[PDB]
Amino acid sequence: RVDVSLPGASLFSGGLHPITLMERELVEIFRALGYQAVEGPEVESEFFNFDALNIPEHHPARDMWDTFWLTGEGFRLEGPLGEEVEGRLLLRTHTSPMQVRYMVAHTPPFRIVVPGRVFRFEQTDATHEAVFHQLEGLVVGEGIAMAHLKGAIYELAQALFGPDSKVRFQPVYFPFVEPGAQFAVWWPEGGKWLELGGAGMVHPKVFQAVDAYRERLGLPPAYRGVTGFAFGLGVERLAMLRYGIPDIRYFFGGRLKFLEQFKGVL
Amino acid sequence: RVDVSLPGASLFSGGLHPITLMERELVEIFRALGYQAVEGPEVESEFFNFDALNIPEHHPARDMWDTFWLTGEGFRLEGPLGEEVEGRLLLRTHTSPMQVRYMVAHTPPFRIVVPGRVFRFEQTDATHEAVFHQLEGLVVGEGIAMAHLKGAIYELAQALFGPDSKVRFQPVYFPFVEPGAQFAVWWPEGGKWLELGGAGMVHPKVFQAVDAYRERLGLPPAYRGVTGFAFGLGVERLAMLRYGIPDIRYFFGGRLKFLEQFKGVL
Numbered sequence: 227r228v229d230v231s232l233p234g235a236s237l238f239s240g241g242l243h244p245i246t247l248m249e250r251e252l253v254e255i256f257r258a259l260g261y262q263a264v265e266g267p268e269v270e271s272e273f274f275n276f277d278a279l280n281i282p283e284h285h286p287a288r289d290m291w292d293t294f295w296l297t298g299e300g301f302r303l304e305g306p307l308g309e310e311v312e313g314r315l316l317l318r319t320h321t322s323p324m325q326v327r328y329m330v331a332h333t334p335p336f337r338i339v340v341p342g343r344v345f346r347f348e349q350t351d352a353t354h355e356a357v358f359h360q361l362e363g364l365v366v367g368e369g370i371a372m373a374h375l376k377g378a379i380y381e382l383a384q385a386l387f388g389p390d391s392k393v394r395f396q397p398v399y400f401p402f403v404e405p406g407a408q409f410a411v412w413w414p415e416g417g418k419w420l421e422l423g424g425a426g427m428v429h430p431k432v433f434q435a436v437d438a439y440r441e442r443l444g445l446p447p448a449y450r451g452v453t454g455f456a457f458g459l460g461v462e463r464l465a466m467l468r469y470g471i472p473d474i475r476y477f478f479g480g481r482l483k484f485l486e487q488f489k490g491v492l
Numbered sequence: 493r494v495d496v497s498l499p500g501a502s503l504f505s506g507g508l509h510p511i512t513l514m515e516r517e518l519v520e521i522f523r524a525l526g527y528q529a530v531e532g533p534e535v536e537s538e539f540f541n542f543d544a545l546n547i548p549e550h551h552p553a554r555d556m557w558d559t560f561w562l563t564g565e566g567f568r569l570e571g572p573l574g575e576e577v578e579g580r581l582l583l584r585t586h587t588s589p590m591q592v593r594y595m596v597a598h599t600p601p602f603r604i605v606v607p608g609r610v611f612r613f614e615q616t617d618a619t620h621e622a623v624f625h626q627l628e629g630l631v632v633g634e635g636i637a638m639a640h641l642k643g644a645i646y647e648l649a650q651a652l653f654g655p656d657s658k659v660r661f662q663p664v665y666f667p668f669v670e671p672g673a674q675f676a677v678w679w680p681e682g683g684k685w686l687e688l689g690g691a692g693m694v695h696p697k698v699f700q701a702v703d704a705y706r707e708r709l710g711l712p713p714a715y716r717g718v719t720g721f722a723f724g725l726g727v728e729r730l731a732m733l734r735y736g737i738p739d740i741r742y743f744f745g746g747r748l749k750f751l752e753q754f755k756g757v758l
C-alpha cells in the first residue's frame with residue numbers, strides 16, 4: 227500500500243520572465259495583423275541610432291536622449307547586409323534603428339515588429355529604468371496612411387483590454403516622423419489612460435537615408451513612392467499595468483520569488 | 493574527478509504528434525491573416541453536419557459522404573448557444589458544420605479557422621483514413637469575394653512552400669458553396685501539384701439556415717447583407733508531403749518509434 231497524498235519526486239518546474247511573456251503577447255497581437263518579428267543588435271552605430279533617423283549632433287534633438295557611448299577596438303559591427311559598418315559605437319537608445327536596418331535589407335510592402343533591449347543613461351525610479359525593452363512597429367507601402375497607424379493601435383487596445391477599450395493620439399515630436407504622435411490606450415478595468423508610446427508617418431528624410439545607403443551598397447532605390455507608419459512602445463510599462471507589477475526595477479532583480487509568480491501566466 | 497562524457501540522469505524527453513505540429517503551423521499561417529481558431533464537437537447532429545449545409549436526405553449529395561451513425565440515449569448534445577439540439581446523432585464527416593455553429597453564435601465580419609477530427613466510413617489505404625483531420629476556414633463580411641478566397645490560399649501556398657509556390661483552383665461541387673471549387677498548391681521542391689481541399693463562396697441557403705436558426709433562438713438575423721468564403725483542407729495530406737510521411741495509417745498507429753521522429757520538428 228502507498229500514501230498517495232505524499233510528495234512526489236521533486237522534478238524542477240520552470241517559467242518565463244515577465245518581459246518574455248509580455249513580449250510574446252504583443253508579438254502575438256501584431257502577428258494577427260500581419261506583422262513579422264525581427265530583431266536588431268543592442269550595440270549600434272551612431273549612424274543607425276541617430277543620423278539615419280534624422281537626429282544630427284549638437285542640436286536640441288540629440289539632447290533629448292541619454293546615450294551610453296562605448297569604446298574598444300577589434301569589435302566588428304555588421305550592417306544590414308553583413309557589411310562592416312563604421313561610426314561611434316553606442317548602446318541603442320531605442321529600437322528605431324532596426325527600422326532603417328530592415329528597410330535597406332528589404333523591399334516594400336511589408337509589416338515588421340521588432341522587440342528589443344534598449345539603454346538610456348538616466349535615473350531609475352519606479353517607472354524608469356536605464357535598461358528596458360521596446361517594441362517597434364513599421365509598415366511601409368503604397369497608400370499607407372495615418373488612419374492605418376490609428377487602426378493598428380486601436381487593434382492593440384481591443385486585443386489588450388477588450389471591446390470597451392479605446393485609443394488616444396496627440397501630436398508630439400520625433401525627428402523620424404511627420405506627422406508625429408504619442409498615444410495612450412484606455413484601460414477599462416483600471417479606469418485610466420496609459421501612455422504607451424510614440425508613432426507617426428515615417429519621415430521623408432528617413433526614406434532618403436535608406437535608399438542613399440542602399441546606393442552606397444549598390445542596391446536600387448526602393449522607397450521613392452511609398453509611405454509608412456512606425457511606432458515604439460514600452461514593454462515594461464505595459465507588463466506592469468498588465469501583470470500588476472508596482473516597480474519597474476523588479477524586472478532585472480533576478481529574485482526567484484518575484485519571477486516564480488509568473489509560472490502560471492502562459 | 494569525473495568522466496564528463498558519461499551519460500547523465502535519464503530525464504524523459506517529450507514530443508508532439510505530427511498532426512499537432514502540422515495543425516499548429518496551419519493555424520499560425522492563418523493567424524497571420526487575421527483568422528481565429530475555434531473548435532467544434534466531434535459527435536454532431538444531422539442538422540449541422542448536413543441539413544444546415546444544404547445536404548438533404550435521399551439525394552445524390554448525401555450519397556457522396558460515408559457517415560457513421562450513432563445510437564444511445566442520455567447523451568446531451570449542446571448547440572451553438574448551449575441549447576439542447578435534437579436530431580440523429582452522428583460523427584461529423586467534416587469540419588463544415590462548425591461553420592454554421594459559429595455563425596449562429598456570432599455576428600459578421602469575422603475570420604475563423606477550425607481544425608478538427610473528422611470521421612468517414614471508408615476503406616483505409618496509404619492516403620485514406622476513416623479517422624483524419626481537416627481545417628475549415630470561414631471569412632464572412634460585406635464585400636467578401638472569391639478573389640479574397642484565392643488570395644487566402646495563395647498566402648497558404650507562399651507560407652508553406654516559399655515564393656516559387658503557386659495555387660490552382662478548378663470548379664467542383666459542394667451543396668454549401670456557389671461558386672464551388674477544389675484547389676491545389678504547387679510544391680516546388682517536389683515538382684508536383686497537391687490537391688489540398690475544397691472551397692467556395694458560402695451558399696445563400698446556408699446563410700438562410702443560419703438566420704432561420706437564429707430566429708428560432710430569438711436572435712436577430714445577421715447574414716442578410718454579407719457574403720463569404722470557406723474552405724476545408726486535409727491536415728494529414730499536408731503533413732505527409734511536408735514531413736515526408738509515406739503512409740497515412742502511421743498517424744494513429746501509436747508507434748513511439750514513429751512519433752519520436754518529430755521531437756525535433758518544432
Ligand SMILES: Nc1ncnc2c1ncn2[C@@H]1O[C@H](COS(=O)(=O)NC(=O)[C@@H](N)Cc2ccc(O)cc2)[C@@H](O)[C@H]1O
Pocket residue numbers: 319320321322346348353354355356358360400402403421422423424425426427428455456457458459460462463474
Ligand atoms: N527610462 C525608461 N524606462 C522605462 N521605459 C522607458 C524609459 N524611457 C522610455 N520608456 C518607454 O519608451 C516609450 C518610447 O520611448 S521614447 O523615448 O519616448 N520614444 C522613442 O524612443 C521613439 N523611438 C518612439 C517612436 C516614435 C515614433 C516612431 O515612428 C517610432 C518610435 C515610452 O512611451 C515609455 O513607455
Ligand SMILES: Nc1ncnc2c1ncn2[C@@H]1O[C@H](COS(=O)(=O)NC(=O)[C@@H](N)Cc2ccc(O)cc2)[C@@H](O)[C@H]1O
Pocket residue numbers: 585586587588612614619620621622624626666668669687688689690691692693694721722723724725726728729740
Ligand atoms: N478518407 C480520407 N482520409 C484522409 N483525408 C481525407 C479523406 N477524405 C477526405 N480527405 C481530405 O479532406 C479534404 C476535403 O474533404 S472533401 O470530402 O473532399 N470536401 C469536404 O469535406 C468539404 N467540407 C470541403 C469544403 C468545400 C467547400 C467549403 O466552402 C468548405 C469545405 C480533401 O481535399 C482530402 O485531402
